Amino acid sequence: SESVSLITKILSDLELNITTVLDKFFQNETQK
Amino acid sequence: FMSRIVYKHYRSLISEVTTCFFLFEKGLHGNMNEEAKIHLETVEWALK
């Protein structure tokens, strides 16, 4: 339980948002 | 008791079990077994 809580907290802190022809599909799908 | 988190005080675990205890609607205590057991206990104490 302590291990799962600690690593869950680390992962949660790691997702908080911070304050040619191929280019068309790239910008539409991957870059977006 | 129902997650992999950890608390800071065991008052919280006491309250967790308390909350899980009150999810069971009152009136289950109105079952025949509970009245039978309280009658049995009273009669046994009287016999003693």
From Swiss-Prot, chain B:
Compartment(s): Host cytoplasm, Host perinuclear region
Similarity remark: Belongs to the Bunyavirales RNA polymerase family.
Additional comment: Classified as His(+) endonuclease since it has a histidine upstream of the active site that coordinates the first cation.
Subunit structure: Interacts with the viral nucleoprotein.
Free-text note on domains in this protein's UniProt record: The N-terminus contains the endonuclease activity (endoN). The central region contains the RdRp activity. The C-terminus contains the cap-binding region.
Known role: RNA-dependent RNA polymerase, which is responsible for the replication and transcription of the viral RNA genome using antigenomic RNA as an intermediate. During transcription, synthesizes subgenomic RNAs and assures their capping by a cap-snatching mechanism, which involves the endonuclease activity cleaving the host capped pre-mRNAs. These short capped RNAs are then used as primers for viral transcription. Cleaves ssRNA substrates but not DNA. Seems to downregulate the expression of its own and heterologous mRNAs through its endonuclease activity.
The protein's name: RNA-directed RNA polymerase L
Organism, as annotated: Hantaan virus (strain 76-118) (Korean hemorrhagic fever virus)
Gene symbol of the encoding locus: L
Residues of the full protein shown: 704 to 751 of 2151
